[PDB]
């Protein structure tokens, strides 16, 4: 039986990978960092409250300038906001209200979004007419669109419930490559700081590192007990943090090919909806169905502090590129900026 | 106020945006959102025709009320990872064909389509997000059911059934078994209407069921149950 033999071979290969890993575990992060002074309590105040959405917020993104933010709500509107003055810059009606993900181009020229339509729409914010227009629609996914990230103005990467992730060429509307290997719906994407690699989290309680150019899965990370809902890349680009329904964040290392640390607490049973890191990566932030967001000492796994003030599930987090502020968005219809 | 001429202008523009957002909100606030759920060839399409790759939205107006219906079928993904989006839907419309009682799934010769419908019904009725959302249930293809029941007893799907092979009894029994799947009998309601391909009363039925759902919910918020 070719099939049985192949399955046995696969089991043997998995055994080799497991041992390769236990071979690198001389000590852990929680031991090497014992001589590192704790951050201490972190207290952050709300500085700005952004009002306007009349529905649950599903996604938010920060522009590279660190002053402009895009938010999406189920009332069919994207809003671009000047965070400093709370003024709205644009309000973009959508062709459908079922929006689950939104992104801001690094240049600031385009905004992408989508969800239960199974397509990704790209809007052009710089026009002669003066109004915002759809420049293109990307279709070819067969499941809902769970996440969109721009590499550059002509390239966007998407993840979908059809279990696949795809790199699209915006000029032609074509899918140029497809990533396969996940078996569950794919929940989230994060790009490496240099754009050369990206990580996809999925409902297989695993995550995969994918080479963008080579279209292949370099490494598979596992160990979560439930679906991974949020993923972030450590600022160096050599590590990543994943959140899941287990109420546990986990830090993985790309060079050891192994989990480095877990963040958990006995009183947290709510799932993790979002994860983010500070500029230095010393602080890890996570949003929970508890209506709160908890800062964590990323090197010690102690709780450093708590943000609170939402009346519903926190759906999204983001940290500006310059590290000056943290934004949180929620089902209560409000986005708050803390510092 | 310290603002420059351009900053003052920017604020005026922001205010106009808010004004327009409020007007769109007012219109949305007056619409009825219905969710259409059915299994396979349940006659869901027939219902859609009578009323008027991703989610499909149908808009119809009856007696000055605007209804938006979402067909969320054909999504081969995890319902759990997107079902919450419909938490605020006014009501759920579920379609089950009655003729399906003697049929099995192509994918599983031993799985009765009618039991598959009941499993689906149960998975949505008792869902956490739908604790207080009522269900409008359409038992369709009653004419094929009447033609078939005289040949095959319901015991082919319900071995426990012990009634006559008459349409009027078998159909009532099927209705009961769906109604019996409601754990929250004291919180949500199941409206049932037997239907067929030639039934012009389906719109009035949905309208009346929706009307009761809205009034009952407005009363709950006034402190009167």
């Amino acid at each position, epitope marked *: 039986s070719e099939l049985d033999q192949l399955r046995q071979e696969a089991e043997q290969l998995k055994n080799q990978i497991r041992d390769a890993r236990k071979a690198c575990a001389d000590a852990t992060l929680s031991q090497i960092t014992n001589n590192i002074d704790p951050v201490g309590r972190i207290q952050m105040r709300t500085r700005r409250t952004l009002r306007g959405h009349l529905a649950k917020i599903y996604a938010m993104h920060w522009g590279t300038d660190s*002053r*402009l933010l895009v938010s999406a709500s189920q009332d069919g509107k994207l809003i671009i906001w*000047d965070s400093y*003055t709370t*003024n709205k*810059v*644009h309000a973009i009606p959508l062709r459908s209200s079922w929006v689950m993900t939104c992104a801001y181009a690094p240049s*600031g020229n385009y905004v992408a979004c989508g969800g239960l339509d199974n397509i990704c729409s790209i809007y052009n914010l710089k026009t*002669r*007419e*003066g*109004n915002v227009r759809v420049s293109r629609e990307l279709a070819g996914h067969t499941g809902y669109l769970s996440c969109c990230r721009f590499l550059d103005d002509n390239q966007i990467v998407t993840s979908s419930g059809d279990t696949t992730c795809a790199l699209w060429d915006i000029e032609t509307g074509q899918q140029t490559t497809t990533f396969t290997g996940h078996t569950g719906d794919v929940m989230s994407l994060s790009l490496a700081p240099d754009t050369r690699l990206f990580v996809s989290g999925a409902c297989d309680a695993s995550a995969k590192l994918w080479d963008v150019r080579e279209g292949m899965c370099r490494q598979t990370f596992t160990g979560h007990e439930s679906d991974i809902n949020a993923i972030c890349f450590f600022p160096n680009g050599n590590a990543f943090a994943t959140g899941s329904d287990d109420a546990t964040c986990r830090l993985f290392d790309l060079r050891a090919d192994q989990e480095l640390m877990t963040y958990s607490h006995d009183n947290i049973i709510c799932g993790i909806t979002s994860v983010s890191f500070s500029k230095s990566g010393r602080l890890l932030l996570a949003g929970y169905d508890d209506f709160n967001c908890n800062v964590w000492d990323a090197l010690k796994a102690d709780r450093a502090g708590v943000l609170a003030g939402h009346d519903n599930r926190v759906s999204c987090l983001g940290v500006t590129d310059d590290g000056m502020a943290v934004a949180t968005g929620s089902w209560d219809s409000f986005l708050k900026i803390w510092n | 106020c*310290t603002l*420059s*001429a*351009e*900053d003052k*202008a*920017a604020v*005026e*523009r922001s205010k*106009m945006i808010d004004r327009n957002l409020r007007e769109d909100g007012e219109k949305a606030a007056r619409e009825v959102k219905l969710l259409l759920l059915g299994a396979g060839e349940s006659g869901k399409n027939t219902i859609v025709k009578q009323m008027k790759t991703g989610i499909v939205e149908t808009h119809f107006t009856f007696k000055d009320l605007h209804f938006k219906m979402f067909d969320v079928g054909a999504q081969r993904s995890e319902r759990k990872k997107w079902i919450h989006c419909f938490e605020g839907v006014t009501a759920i419309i579920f379609c089950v064909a009655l003729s399906d009682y003697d049929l099995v799934l192509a994918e599983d010769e031993e799985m009765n389509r009618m039991h598959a419908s009941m499993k689906l019904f149960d998975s949505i009725c008792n869902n956490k997000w739908f604790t207080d959302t009522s269900i409008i249930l359409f038992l369709n293809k009653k004419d094929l059911f009447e033609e078939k029941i005289k040949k095959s007893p319901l015991t082919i799907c319900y071995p426990e059934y012990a009634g006559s092979n008459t349409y009027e009894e078998a159909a009532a029994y099927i209705q009961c078994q769906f109604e019996d799947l409601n754990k929250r009998k004291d919180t949500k309601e199941i409206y049932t209407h037997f239907t067929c391909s030639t039934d012009t009363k389906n719109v009035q039925f949905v309208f009346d069921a929706v009307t009761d759902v809205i009034i009952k919910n407005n009363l709950k918020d006034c402190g009167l149950f």
Partner: single-chain antibody
Amino acid sequence: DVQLVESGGGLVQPGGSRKLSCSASGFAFSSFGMHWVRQAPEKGLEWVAYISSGSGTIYYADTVKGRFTISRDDPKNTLFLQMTSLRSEDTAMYYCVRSIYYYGSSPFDFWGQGTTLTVSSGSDIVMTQATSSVPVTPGESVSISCRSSKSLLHSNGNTYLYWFLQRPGQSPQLLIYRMSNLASGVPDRFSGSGSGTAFTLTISRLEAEDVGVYYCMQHLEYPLTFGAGTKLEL
């Protein structure tokens, strides 16, 4: 493409009245605030009036206040100037100018062609263009300066200075907005550098197209004001 076509000019006797009209095509008229700028035969641009998007705010120059009314009809995409009690000084070419304000916008980018109106028989910020003209030749570097009565810098950190180029027989065109930013469709050779009350526009690799009159504009407060203009020649 974007168009503004003014009409309603002609000859009027003093004390009489005319109504000017600016039809708008190719853009969302409702979202854009509109201005009227007049250039007399003296070739010095003067701001006349402003109507905001939605008609919420209207400002007029002191000279025309009470004799001129600005109105917009968004459904017909038209901008109107009602001129009454016309005086000889009112003779000029009137330009309809497009402007939108939000963070990162670039107002005054699009100018109409204008109409000609002929009429028979101290707190303002003042800007000076010390040089009335500069002879230039192709390939050379050119420095055009402007000075202001008060600093155009603001607490927000934005210096509100705009540079416009009017080629002969053509409407003025924005080159630089807010001191250092280049307008779309403007070659990289043009650059703007300034501090406080003193500003410089630097043109490199000069070309025949570049030759024309250059105007500095103040936009910190109303009235908006312009300098005299510097002419390049040769």
